[PDB]
Structure 1
Amino acid sequence: KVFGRCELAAAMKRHGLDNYRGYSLGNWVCAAKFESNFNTQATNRNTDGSTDYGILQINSRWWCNDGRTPGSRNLCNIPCSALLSSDITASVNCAKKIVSDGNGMNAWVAWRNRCKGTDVQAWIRGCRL
């Protein structure tokens, strides 16, 4: 599923991401835009053989099991394929663990390089929240 901007914002707010660990909603929408272009089916291979999955491009090296990243962890205790669902519950729940691990949203390279320090509130402007 390819979300609309305000559709995704509403879904993330319902699942408790607004101001989660101090990150306002616009941060999460900005991150999803540049990680996946709001596409729940996005996948990208990393040079170490791990793969990033879903709307927030969560990495199989640490966070999910895809059966083909030897020596990796599964800290969210999910198959990586669950992160590609049109329902973003699994992605949000796993993102909550990632952002809680000490590095904040710096875990998402696109957030650090394209959202951090910008007017992220613009990503939820015009949305009925």
Structure 2
Amino acid sequence: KVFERCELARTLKRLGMDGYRGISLANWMCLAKWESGYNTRATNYNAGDRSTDYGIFQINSRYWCNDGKTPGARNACHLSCSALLQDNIADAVACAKRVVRDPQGIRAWVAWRNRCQNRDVRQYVQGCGV
């Protein structure tokens, strides 16, 4: 599923993401925007280390979910990477929250650093009723 902007903002808010570990909803929106264009089916293979990024947040298989084919990988979210490709984003959100419970927080995603960090991200949530 490819979410429309405001639809996703309310969906994330309902799932408890607004201010989760100090991260505003606009930051999560900016992250989902740049990682997948709000696409839950998005996948990116990383030929360099044999891992794959899954779903709306493009969560990596080497550390967060199990896909069985990533060498020396762990499953910190304790989910099949398949759960990160559902139209329903509850599991992907549960995993994203797990990622940010680590020291780096939102900085875990390099796309956030490049396209969201220190930027005016208000535009992602304007008019959405969040």
Work out whether the TM-score is over 0.5.
yes
Residue in structure 1 matched with residue 115 of structure 2 by the alignment: 114
Residue in structure 1 matched with residue 56 of structure 2 by the alignment: 55
Residue in structure 1 matched with residue 42 of structure 2 by the alignment: 42
Q: Secondary structure at the match of 2:39?
A: coil
Aligned Cα root-mean-square deviation (Å): 0.7
Residue in structure 1 matched with residue 91 of structure 2 by the alignment: 90
Letter in structure 2 aligned against 1:111: W
Residue in structure 2 matched with residue 6 of structure 1 by the alignment: 6
Residue in structure 2 matched with residue 33 of structure 1 by the alignment: 33
Residue in structure 2 matched with residue 125 of structure 1 by the alignment: 126
* CA shift for structure 1 position 111: 0.7
Instruction: Return the alpha-carbon distance in structure 1 between the equivalents of residues 127 and 81 of structure 2.
Output: 33
Structure 2 unpaired stretches of 5+: none
* CA shift for structure 1 position 22: 0.7
User: Under a length normalisation based on structure 2, what TM-score does the superposition of the two structures give?
Assistant: 0.97
Letter in structure 2 aligned against 1:109: V
User: Under a length normalisation based on structure 1, what TM-score does the superposition of the two structures give?
Assistant: 0.98
Instruction: Return the alpha-carbon distance in structure 2 between the equivalents of residues 8 and 84 of structure 1.
Output: 15
Q: Percent identity?
A: 61
Instruction: Return the alpha-carbon distance in structure 1 between the equivalents of residues 113 and 52 of structure 2.
Output: 19
Alignment map for 1:15-34 (pairs within 5 Å): 15-34=15-34
Q: Secondary structure at the match of 1:3?
A: coil
Instruction: Return the alpha-carbon distance in structure 2 between the equivalents of residues 19 and 58 of structure 1.
Output: 20
Instruction: Return the alpha-carbon distance in structure 1 between the equivalents of residues 79 and 105 of structure 2.
Output: 21
Structure 1 unpaired stretches of 5+: none
Runs of 4+ aligned structure 1 residues displaced above 2 Å come to none
Q: Secondary structure at the match of 1:32?
A: helix
- What is the total number of aligned residue pairs between the two structures? 129
